[PDB]
């Protein structure tokens, strides 16, 4: 599913990303824009055989299991395919696990480069939230 901007904002707020771990909602919508262009089916293959999945391009070497790199971690304890679902629950829950302890949204380089320090509230502007 390719979400509309406000539609994604609405779904992320319903799943609790608004102000999660110090990050206002716009941060998450902006990260998703630059990671997947809001497409839940986005995937990208890496040189180590892992794959990045979903609206937030979560990596299979660490966060989910796809069975393609035996011995890798599945820190979110989910099949990577759940991260391609039109229902963003699995991506949201895993993203909350990623941003915990000393791991901030810097874990997403595109967020750091394209969103951090910008007027992120603009991503939710005009949305029925």
């Amino acid at each position: 599913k390719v979400f509309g901007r406000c539609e994604l904002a609405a779904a992320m707020k319903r799943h609790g990303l608004d102000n999660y771990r110090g990050y206002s909602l716009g941060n998450w919508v902006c990260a998703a824009k630059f990671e997947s262009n809001f497409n839940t089916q986005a995937t990208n293959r890496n040189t180590d055989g892992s794959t990045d999945y979903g609206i937030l391009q979560i990596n299979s070497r660490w966060w989910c299991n796809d069975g393609r790199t035996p011995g890798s971690r599945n820190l979110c304890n989910i099949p990577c395919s759940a991260l391609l679902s039109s229902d963003i629950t699995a991506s949201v829950n895993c993203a909350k696990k990623i941003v915990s302890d000393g791991n901030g949204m810097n874990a997403w380089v595109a967020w750091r480069n394209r969103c951090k320090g910008t007027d992120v509230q603009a991503w939710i502007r005009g949305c029925r939230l």
Partner: nanobody
Amino acid sequence: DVQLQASGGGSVQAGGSLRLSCAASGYTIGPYCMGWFRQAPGKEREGVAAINMGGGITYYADSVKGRFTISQDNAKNTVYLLMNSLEPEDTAIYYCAADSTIYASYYECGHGLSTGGYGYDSWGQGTQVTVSS
């Protein structure tokens, strides 16, 4: 509290080899990257080699390609740098480094090698390597 401890190195004649090793302590998960940087007398620190702990993909500075080999032992959080065909120009203080961020999407550990160590938040004290002329 992250701590990187390296050993190996020392002095050698040009054409010789040395093997450096580095152990990270204090992590429960990660590091994501481990690498080697070096700083010759009076010079800026520069990158040498890096490796993704997740996947083992390696990255080398053009100055050591084909001569140095970086490797890892993920379960033991240790990284190694095999240095063959050493030259006087390789003399320097060598530093073990690690990036502790567990990136969400795939991250190439070689990125920090040429951007002044960007992302490498932990550093060893430095190990001397001296290659005779």
